[PDB]
Amino acid sequence: SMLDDAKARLRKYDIGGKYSHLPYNKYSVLLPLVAKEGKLHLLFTVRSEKLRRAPGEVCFPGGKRDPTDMDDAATALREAQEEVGLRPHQVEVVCCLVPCLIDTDTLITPFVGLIDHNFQAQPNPAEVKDVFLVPLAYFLHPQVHDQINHIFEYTNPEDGVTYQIKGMTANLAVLVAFIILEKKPT
C-alpha cells in the first residue's frame, strides 16, 4: 500500500539515536504525514503573532526538550499535543532524520510521523494562528520566489489563501518528498 511503501522508504534514512547524546541546546520537530484523497500531505503551522521567536512564520510543530521528556521523540510528541491537539495514539513515529546544526550551540532533531485518518487539528491560539496541509508532490515542483534566498509560495485551492514556506522547514519538506516519491512507477 501507499502507507506501507512510505514507511519502508523512510526507514532507510533513519539515523536513530546516533547524535541524541551530544551536549547541545536540544529541540525536536514533528513532520506529520496525512493521507487524503489518495495522496500524502504534510501538515504545517502558522506561528501566532504574539510569540517572541518568529511570530507569523510557517513551521512544523516542535520546541525545546524539557526534563520530563524520556527521549527526543517524546519532545516532538509533547509539543505536537500542546500546539495542535495531536494525541500519541494518533501518531506512529517512523524515523529520525538528519539533525540540523544551528548557531554553533543548538541541534534540532526531525521526526517523521504517520497521522490517523480521523485526526482533526485543534489549534492552541496562544501558539498557533493557523494549520494547513500541502500535498507532498508539491515540493518536487514548487513555486519559487527569491527574497538571494529561496522562498516557496503555496496557494490552497479550497480558499485561495497563500502561504510562504522557507528555511529549515522548506529544506525538510523537500527532503521527505525526495525520500518517498523518487523513482516510482505511475
Binding residues for ligand H0S, per CB under 6 A? 3-4, 7, 27, 29, 53-54, 57, 59-60, 62-63, 90-92, 102-103, 106, 108, 114, 116, 168
79 marked as part of a ligand binding site: yes
Least separation in angstroms between CB 32 and ligand H0S: 10
The response to whether 127 counts as a known ligand-binding position is no
- Per the listing, cell 494562528 goes with 129
State which residue, 49 or 158, has the beta carbon closest to ligand H0S. Answer: 49
Distance of closest approach, residue 157 Cβ to ligand H0S, in angstroms: 25
What distance in Å separates the CA atoms of residue 183 and residue 186, rounded to the nearest whole number? 10
Residues in the chain: 186
Asked whether the beta carbons of 51 and 59 are under 8 A apart, the reply is: no
Nearer to ligand H0S, 3 or 144 (CB): 3
Which C-beta is closer to ligand H0S: that of 12 or that of 53?
A: 53
Q: Which is nearer to ligand H0S, 4 or 158 (CB)?
A: 4
Phi, psi of 50 (to 5 degrees): -95, -5
State the nearest-atom distance from the C-beta of 168 to ligand H0S, in Å: 5
Pairing label, strands 39-47, 25-36 = antiparallel
Closer to ligand H0S at the Cβ: 168 or 175?
Answer: 168
What cell does 24 get?
547541545
**Helix H segments across the chain?**
2-11, 72-84, 167-181
**Least Cβ distance, residue 20 to ligand H0S (angstroms):** 17
Distances (CA, A) of 163 to 7, 34, 137: 28, 19, 16
With CB atoms as reference, the residue minimizing the distance to ligand H0S is 62
Quick one: which of 23, 19, 167, 29 has its CA closest to 105?
23
Q: Which residue from 16, 1, 17, 19 is spatially nearest to 106, judged by alpha carbons?
A: 19
Q: How far is the CB of 60 from ligand H0S (least distance, A)?
A: 5
Residue ranges of the annotated binding site for Mg(2+) are 79, 83
